[PDB]
Amino acid sequence: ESQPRQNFKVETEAGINRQINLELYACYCYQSMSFYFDRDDVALPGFTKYFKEKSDEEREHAEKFMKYQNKRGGRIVLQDVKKPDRDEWGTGLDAMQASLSLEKNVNQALLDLHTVGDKEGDKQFMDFLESDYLEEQVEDIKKISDHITNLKRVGSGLGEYMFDKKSLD
Among residue numbers 63 through 92, which ones bind a second copy (CB under 8 A)? 63, 66-67, 69-73, 75-84, 87
For residue 136, count other CB atoms closer than 10 A to its CB: 17
Q: How far is the CB of 135 from a second copy (least distance, A)?
A: 6
Residue 158 is which amino acid? L
> Cα 155 to the chain's mean position, in Å?
26
Q: Is 118 in the site for a second copy (CB under 8 A)?
A: yes
Query: Given the rule CB under 5 A, which residues bind Fe ion?
Result: 23, 58, 61, 103, 106, 127, 130, 140
Q: Is 31 in the site for a second copy (CB under 8 A)?
A: yes
The one among 9, 12, 15, 36 contacting a second copy by CB under 8 A: 36
Instruction: Give the list of residues 6+ apart from residue 95 with CB closer than 8 angstroms, or none.
Output: 33, 36, 37, 47, 51, 89
Q: Is 60 annotated as a binding residue?
A: no
For residue 3, the SS3 value is: coil
Q: How far is the CB of 26 from Fe ion (least distance, A)?
A: 5
CB distance 51 to 143 below 8 Å:
no
For residue 31, count other CB atoms closer than 10 A to its CB: 18
Q: Is 153 in the site for a second copy (CB under 8 A)?
A: yes
Q: Select the binding partner of residue 39 from a second copy, Fe ion, none (C-beta < 5 to 8 A, by kind).
A: a second copy
